[PDB]
Design a protein around this ligand. Structure first.
Ligand code: NA
Length: 96
């Protein structure tokens, strides 16, 4: 897997990707990195749209990363990911 991703020191796969994401559920966002155990930043509600710059795979999900007003980095899970099969669940929103 991950021929066109890189991998960081926590084993998170990442690559640059510029697009928007419109949520279709209340999706919890995280501070610090793409782990559900991290401190919560907040939520996207259905119909809210963010512009992201990086896609990551960690903690059972694909995540996208964007920047808050204050400059902080915010990590948003968008679908499930199975690492051993290299397959993805359905998106929880709309890309672009
Ligand atoms: Na992991």
């Amino acid at each position: 897997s991950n021929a066109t991703y890189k991998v960081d020191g926590k084993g998170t796969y990442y690559k640059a990707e510029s697009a928007s994401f419109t949520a279709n559920y209340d999706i919890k966002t995280r501070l610090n990195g793409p782990f559900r155990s991290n401190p919560q930043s907040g939520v996207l509600h259905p119909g809210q749209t963010i512009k992201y710059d990086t896609v990551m795979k960690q903690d059972g999900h694909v995540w996208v990363v964007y920047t808050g007003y204050s400059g902080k980095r915010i990590y948003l899970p968008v679908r499930t990911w199975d690492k051993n099969s290299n397959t993805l669940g359905p998106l929880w929103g709309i890309i672009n």
